């Protein structure tokens, strides 16, 4: 489980797309 958490925190995050661009614009109005 300990190693299972590390393979979800470090192994997590490893664009001219309309959806992507729209997401970023919305994501700012929350964070």
């Amino acid at each position: 489980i300990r190693k299972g958490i590390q393979l979800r925190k470090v192994e997590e995050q490893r664009e001219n797309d309309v959806a992507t661009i729209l997401s970023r614009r919305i994501a700012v109005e929350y964070s």
Binding site: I1, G4, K9, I26, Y30, S31
Partner: protein, 536 residues
């Protein structure tokens, strides 16, 4: 369009499942939880061929692609939220999972999505793995929070958190807040539901155990029990063994129970002196009581989780009954027979008898699946099996070290004055925790709860030392003599009357615990020689 459709059906799900009484109570308090406005998305969801610039666009297919991704993100957030919180938050998780289930159902009227179970198993990482994220976080929290920090209250059947100096804190990675649609639906609903589940954060009890049972299933429970056994094996044969061996030496070689005639005050003084080194042992509570409480909480978890499982099974079987030919006893008026009407009622519910109907009208594949399904439905643990006995039997084998039982008795029968058996050390520990503390000091029961005594009593019972403990216990002897003489003095700052009152309370608790353990733990005896003459 896909964004607002998902958000719309999530808010609908959240509203549908929101307690109606609470809604009206909030309205009267001038804080109406505002019902979401209805919309008209269905015609858009039914578009399979939008004709645009010569293309035929399947709008339904495109919406589904996004709505399915949103469903998965909701489920990931629910499980991730659990992973960042303690065990008490599992009730909140269950509610949120149920809102997600309702969301999927509402969306499934118009869209084709993966089955909810498939979605859930994937998010739970329980497709290519045997135990999901929820099961693994439960054990994680048991090991790091529940066992070390909780105090069982046997009268209310609830666990609560220990006192501040014993509270073993560890930093939690608090999840970044996503958009309301990925939770309960709106800010208002998020606030409403987090208030609803606020009640469940201050204890662990039957509702938490009920949820744990469902979410883990038979396989999760099995692995948690098996692992709790390993924690106990590690504690008993490790640090506890180490401190028992240490304290057995510090313990007075011999300790006789002084005769009634000395009086209760003098007997109290005697015990104070004789057990001074156990009393003054700096790590008795921080290490010895702590590790025992963890053993107790582990054994309590097993008992209580078995009981929840039994409640879950019995309810399943009640709902299975009509499809499984099982009928309750019917009332017989005069001029009727019990066998006559029971057969006649069996006729009425024959169209509901599942296996016979499929055997009549179904395929060999359908018949075989139903036969297997029927066997799984009727055969539950509550039917004729139990677990707690097996748990206890296996813990006994962890006590093979010679200092639990000590050397063979001098008299060929039993030790009496000698302090070479665990129960005698426990008696010294009991002496310590029966001592009254200041009015603004925390007590042993406030710090460790019942688990401490469950562990200590479990060791005694499994060693078969409970009768000798009952006879030879120091505190029980003091109580016995005080009852007789009725004297009340403050001996070494211990007011005798208060001391013997506490002893009675723990005596009651011990007897309940010992009796329970003995009950669940459901031959030839050692015989002795009569005197023999020199003649033969």
């Amino acid at each position: 369009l896909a964004d607002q459709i998902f958000a719309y059906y999530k808010v609908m799900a959240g509203s549908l499942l929101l307690d109606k009484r609470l809604r009206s109570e909030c309205k009267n308090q001038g804080a109406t939880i505002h019902l979401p406005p209805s919309n008209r998305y269905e015609t858009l969801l039914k578009q399979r061929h939008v004709q645009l610039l010569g293309r035929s666009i399947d709008l339904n297919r495109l919406i589904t692609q996004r709505v399915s991704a949103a469903m998965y993100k909701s489920l990931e957030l629910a499980i991730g939220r659990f992973e960042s919180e303690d065990l008490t938050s599992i009730v909140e998780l269950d509610g949120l999972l149920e809102i997600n289930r309702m969301t999927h159902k509402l969306l499934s009227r118009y869209l084709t999505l993966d089955g909810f179970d498939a979605m859930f198993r994937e998010a739970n990482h329980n497709v290519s793995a045997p135990y999901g994220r929820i099961t693994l976080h439960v054990f994680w929290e048991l090991n790091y929070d529940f066992l070390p920090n909780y105090c069982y209250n046997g009268s209310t059947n609830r666990f609560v958190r220990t006192v501040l100096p014993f509270s073993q804190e560890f930093q939690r990675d608090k999840q970044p807040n996503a958009q309301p649609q990925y939770l309960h639906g709106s800010k208002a609903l998020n606030l409403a539901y987090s208030s609803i589940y606020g009640s469940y954060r201050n204890f662990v009890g039957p509702p938490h155990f009920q949820v744990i049972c469902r979410l883990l299933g038979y396989q999760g429970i099995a692995v948690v029990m098996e692992e709790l056994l390993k924690v106990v094996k590690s504690l008993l044969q490790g640090t506890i063994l180490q401190y028992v061996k240490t304290l057995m030496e510090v313990m007075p070689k011999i300790c006789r129970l002084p005769r009634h005639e000395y009086g209760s005050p003098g007997i109290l003084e005697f015990f104070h002196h004789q057990l001074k080194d156990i009393v003054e042992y700096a790590e008795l509570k921080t290490v010895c009581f702590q590790n025992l409480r963890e053993v107790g909480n582990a054994i309590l978890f097993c008992l209580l989780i078995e009981q929840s499982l039994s409640l879950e099974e019995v309810c399943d079987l009640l709902h299975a009954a009509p499809f499984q030919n099982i009928l309750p006893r019917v009332h017989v008026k005069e001029g009727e027979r019990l066998d006559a009407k029971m057969k006649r009622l069996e006729s009425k519910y024959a169209p509901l008898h599942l296996v016979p109907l499929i055997e009549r009208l179904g395929t060999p594949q359908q018949i075989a699946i139903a036969r297997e399904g029927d066997l799984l439905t009727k055969e539950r643990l509550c039917c004729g099996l139990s677990m707690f006995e097996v748990i206890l039997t296996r813990i006994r084998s962890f006590l093979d070290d010679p200092i639990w039982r000590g050397p063979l008795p001098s008299n060929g029968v039993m030790h009496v004055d000698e302090c070479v058996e665990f129960h005698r050390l426990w008696s010294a520990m009991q002496f310590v925790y029966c001592i009254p503390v200041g009015t603004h000091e925390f007590t042993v029961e406030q710090c460790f709860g019942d688990g401490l005594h469950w562990a200590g009593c479990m060791i005694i019972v499994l060693l078969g030392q409970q009768r000798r403990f009952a006879v030879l216990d120091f505190c029980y002897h003091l109580l016995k003599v005080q009852k007789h003489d009725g004297k009340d003095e403050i001996i070494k700052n211990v007011p005798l009357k208060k001391m013997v009152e506490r002893i009675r309370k723990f005596q009651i608790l011990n007897d309940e615990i010992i009796t329970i353990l003995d009950k669940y733990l459901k031959e030839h005896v050692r015989c002795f020689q009569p005197p023999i003459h020199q003649s033969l």
